Amino acid sequence: IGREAVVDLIQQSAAKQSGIRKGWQVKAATWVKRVHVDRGDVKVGRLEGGEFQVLPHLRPRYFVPADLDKFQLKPYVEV
Amino acid sequence: GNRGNTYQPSRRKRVNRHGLEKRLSTPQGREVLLRRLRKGRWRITVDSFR
Amino acid sequence: EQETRLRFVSSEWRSGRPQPPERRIPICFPNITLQMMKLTPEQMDQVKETGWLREVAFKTTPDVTKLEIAAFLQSVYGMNVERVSTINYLGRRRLAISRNGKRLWWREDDWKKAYVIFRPPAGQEHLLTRQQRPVIEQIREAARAPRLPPRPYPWERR
Amino acid sequence: ATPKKKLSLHRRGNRRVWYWLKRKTEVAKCSYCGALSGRNQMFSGAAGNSACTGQCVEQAPTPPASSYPAE
Amino acid sequence: LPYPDAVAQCSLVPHKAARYMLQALEAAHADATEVKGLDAERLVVGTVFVTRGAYEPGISYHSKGRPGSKTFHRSHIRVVLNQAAERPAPFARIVAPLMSRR
RNA sequence: CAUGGAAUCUGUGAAUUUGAAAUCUUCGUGCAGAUGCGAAGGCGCUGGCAAGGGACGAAGAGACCCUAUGCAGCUUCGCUGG
RNA sequence: UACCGUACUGCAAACCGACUCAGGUGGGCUAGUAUAUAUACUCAGGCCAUAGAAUCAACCAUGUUAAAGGAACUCGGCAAAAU
RNA sequence: AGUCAUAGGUAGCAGAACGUUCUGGAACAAUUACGCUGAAAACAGUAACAGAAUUGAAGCUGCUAACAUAAGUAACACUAAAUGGAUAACAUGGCCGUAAGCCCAAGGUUUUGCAUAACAAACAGUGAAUACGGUU
RNA sequence: ACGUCUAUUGGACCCGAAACCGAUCGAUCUAGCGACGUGCAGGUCUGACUUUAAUCAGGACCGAACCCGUGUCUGUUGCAAGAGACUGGGAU
RNA sequence: GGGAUUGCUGACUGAUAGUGCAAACAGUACUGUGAAGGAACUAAUGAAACUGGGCUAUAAGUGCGCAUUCCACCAAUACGU
Ligand SMILES: [Mg+2]
Ligand SMILES: [Mg+2]
Ligand SMILES: [Mg+2]
Ligand SMILES: [Mg+2]
Ligand SMILES: [Mg+2]
Ligand SMILES: [Mg+2]
Ligand SMILES: [Mg+2]
Ligand SMILES: [Mg+2]
Ligand SMILES: [Mg+2]
Ligand SMILES: [Mg+2]
Ligand SMILES: [Mg+2]
Ligand SMILES: [Mg+2]
Ligand SMILES: [Mg+2]
Ligand SMILES: [Mg+2]
Ligand SMILES: [Mg+2]
Ligand SMILES: [Mg+2]
Ligand SMILES: [Mg+2]
Ligand SMILES: [Mg+2]
Ligand SMILES: [Mg+2]
Ligand SMILES: [Mg+2]
Ligand SMILES: [Mg+2]
Ligand SMILES: [Mg+2]
Ligand SMILES: [Mg+2]
Ligand SMILES: [Mg+2]
Ligand SMILES: [Mg+2]
Ligand SMILES: [Mg+2]
Ligand SMILES: [Mg+2]
Ligand SMILES: [Mg+2]
Ligand SMILES: [Mg+2]
Ligand SMILES: [Mg+2]
Ligand SMILES: [Zn+2]
């Protein structure tokens, strides 16, 4: 009867009929061109005077290893 | 006056009337959603997407 | 298996404005996917030697950022990225008619297309590699040119 | 303004006599290319005839003329 | 009719159906002359008839909300060319064209 | 007289209706106004284009009247209730 | 200095009317004769695809002209004409 | 096995049978049937004895599906107008021009581009870098 | 007891109402209200203010954009389950 | 009373039947603003309406796959293979 319980049952019902977006989901997929849906991005800042300011600690940093060249493990193991 | 064109489309009004949150805002809307679930409808509300 | 949840337009309207996180960690084990599209064969020969192009277009997932694509290319592939331009695309609709005629309809997963403009690596900048004619003569020739024919119809024979 | 009963197969056939076409009693046949048309109509290559070999016209000599070509 | 004046009767009308009838008669003639060994210029169209085909049902929009139909019809053609014991009367006099002129 | 339908040809291409029909006229008869019964007579057969007297043309199992253990709403010095 | 929109259509064959539906659909910009965004012709621009082909049917719709009269028509000058 | 008597029927009442599906009695169609007739009818020609029935259909302006009739009939008349052997690029003519032009909004959501048929949707296409609209 | 036929209670041989009682969804059509924003070509008349002057009023008048639908005609399984043409009414 | 496994259970039904659904995606397509309503479709065989033409005018065998019971290993108490 609670609000969260109804939403959880809706999501469990939507767990079935999932995968590559068949049926009604083909039309419902076009809601992203109709109501400005925000995608799964991480926000890097905030507007103060309408000019966006990217906070430098929220800029993306990738900890790549020192050398991936002549490293002795490949993505494939011999049979 | 010609009839038949009562449906004037609007996304704001469609989501604000038959969306998930107005259904969840009231108890009888929540039993409407519950019997939509018990019937087995693939689309629960007019604004559901993934 | 846990997968993509349904989202609701009224729910994103009500619980709106995602906030920036308080801390950002350097990303060990990143989950980010890029792929090129088709290149012209002369561009493919341009990549086969010296490994460079000024403009390369990529398919990504729509949860990425221009900063993330620029940082990933600079960090992993050693490139110099000047600017990124991102376009959100819908999936293609697919039709796969069944044993009884049903019109089974699919939709591909939504993708983001990035246009990445590159920069010459170090000292190699010569490979930008490009008489006159008056623009008054250009416009006057392009005004006396024959018009484009109207588009034929798919049943029409010409 | 409305049929009161259903028309029978015999009555329908009798009513449909106006719809039938009359057979033509003459045809102009080209001996070479086997083309078929009316005797008052050109049916050679200038008209529609992809089978024309030109043997339909058996003589056409006209070399001499003199005029001012306007250019 | 015999075969040549049947081709003449099909070739002398502007109807769309006459081209399909020409296609059926030409296919029957090709079977009779090259698949079989029947003599030409003695073939008579002794059996030709039209049977029903599978239709494509449609819809037409009458006024006041009433539906209608624009069903696309189809048909089949059976042509049988017999060989006569004698070359027959051609039934349509062959005259010279406009091209055959001095 | 002008324009556009209609009428001719080519191409696309419905629906109302429909017990089965191979459905004449007059007079009489008849559930009381007969294409179908009786008497007499007429009629080569089938159509196109027109006109609509008939087929109690077709279109609504409700125009009006009556009936229901009928409903509904309204009215009141009809009845009963806080 | 990120994220979302950016194709195409938008008085319409792509929206709302079951339709390629003679209906309904908001705001803005604009040249000359010329003078008002009215009216006639035209600029920039666009269009002459969604049945075609001839011809003297009757009849129907929409109009032009009509001798002498003139509401005599008709329930009623309705409709046309007229200013 | 020879004489006599009875046999029009609506509503209604009584009696005798035919047929369909399934089951019990161990199994009645593996390799088919097909001399075309028989019987008063329902029907029969792949048992029979009993039993259990969602058991028999021209007949409810019944429901579903298919196929006819009207009938190749009506319609393809709101508009600017087309012509040259092409829904032509070229030429000629015409129509709108406070629209039938241009730019957006709402809404639609790929309807958008490519082949002198073709094997082409399976392929492409929407780039914020002017303090563009939103998010505030 | 079984079999058959009636009878009673059940929806009780089948199909068919108008109904009545509850509690879901609907003001995207339409009626009223409320908040914010936008629009009203061209002229005409009257009253007022200021005038070396680029201001206001009238449920004013004629008339486009726009709103409505008076009369006639067409249409009546229509272009349209209420439309078209011409006249019309309002248009600070 | 309710929710899932099993039924050497069925004089229950067999694709207009049986659940609304035996099916690649049935509470689907589609209808409606919405609540809500809500289909059709198995594999062969191919009846009738309908429309053209013609005419008339030996209740058996043999193979596979299991189930029952024997046997011999068994957890050694229901059979475990
Ligand atoms: Mg109006
Ligand atoms: Mg509707
Ligand atoms: Mg005409
Ligand atoms: Mg009489
Ligand atoms: Mg006659
Ligand atoms: Mg007639
Ligand atoms: Mg009474
Ligand atoms: Mg309009
Ligand atoms: Mg309509
Ligand atoms: Mg329209
Ligand atoms: Mg003009
Ligand atoms: Mg045209
Ligand atoms: Mg006079
Ligand atoms: Mg008797
Ligand atoms: Mg007797
Ligand atoms: Mg048995
Ligand atoms: Mg029964
Ligand atoms: Mg025709
Ligand atoms: Mg042309
Ligand atoms: Mg848009
Ligand atoms: Mg962008
Ligand atoms: Mg008893
Ligand atoms: Mg409400
Ligand atoms: Mg007016
Ligand atoms: Mg007035
Ligand atoms: Mg069923
Ligand atoms: Mg079926
Ligand atoms: Mg059922
Ligand atoms: Mg089958
Ligand atoms: Mg048969
Ligand atoms: Zn020739």
mmCIF file of C-alpha atoms (C1' of nucleotides) in Angstrom, chain B residues 6-7 14 18 23 32 35-36 39-44 46, chain J residues 20 25-38:
data_model
loop_
_atom_site.group_PDB
_atom_site.id
_atom_site.type_symbol
_atom_site.label_atom_id
_atom_site.label_comp_id
_atom_site.label_asym_id
_atom_site.label_seq_id
_atom_site.Cartn_x
_atom_site.Cartn_y
_atom_site.Cartn_z
ATOM 1 C CA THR B 6 -11.133 16.319 -28.422
ATOM 2 C CA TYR B 7 -7.548 15.041 -28.038
ATOM 3 C CA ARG B 14 -0.106 14.061 -20.267
ATOM 4 C CA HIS B 18 -1.567 10.192 -16.058
ATOM 5 C CA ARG B 23 -0.887 7.984 -9.516
ATOM 6 C CA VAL B 32 -5.121 1.660 -9.752
ATOM 7 C CA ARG B 35 -4.476 -3.631 -10.331
ATOM 8 C CA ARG B 36 -2.539 -2.619 -13.454
ATOM 9 C CA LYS B 39 -3.604 -7.606 -14.702
ATOM 10 C CA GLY B 40 -0.082 -7.837 -16.097
ATOM 11 C CA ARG B 41 0.199 -4.727 -18.283
ATOM 12 C CA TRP B 42 3.551 -4.187 -19.963
ATOM 13 C CA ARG B 43 3.258 -0.382 -19.770
ATOM 14 C CA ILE B 44 2.419 0.679 -16.219
ATOM 15 C CA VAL B 46 1.957 6.741 -19.895
ATOM 16 C "C1'" G J 20 -8.600 -13.736 -22.603
ATOM 17 C "C1'" C J 25 6.764 -10.602 -28.212
ATOM 18 C "C1'" A J 26 -0.924 -12.287 -24.896
ATOM 19 C "C1'" G J 27 -2.945 -8.996 -20.973
ATOM 20 C "C1'" U J 28 0.292 -8.482 -26.882
ATOM 21 C "C1'" A J 29 -1.429 -5.895 -31.445
ATOM 22 C "C1'" C J 30 -5.282 -2.659 -31.420
ATOM 23 C "C1'" U J 31 -9.262 0.894 -29.053
ATOM 24 C "C1'" G J 32 -9.672 4.971 -25.410
ATOM 25 C "C1'" U J 33 -7.291 11.381 -22.621
ATOM 26 C "C1'" G J 34 -7.581 7.911 -18.691
ATOM 27 C "C1'" A J 35 -9.316 4.224 -15.439
ATOM 28 C "C1'" A J 36 -10.534 0.417 -18.731
ATOM 29 C "C1'" G J 37 -11.713 -2.920 -22.808
ATOM 30 C "C1'" G J 38 -9.312 -6.501 -25.543
#
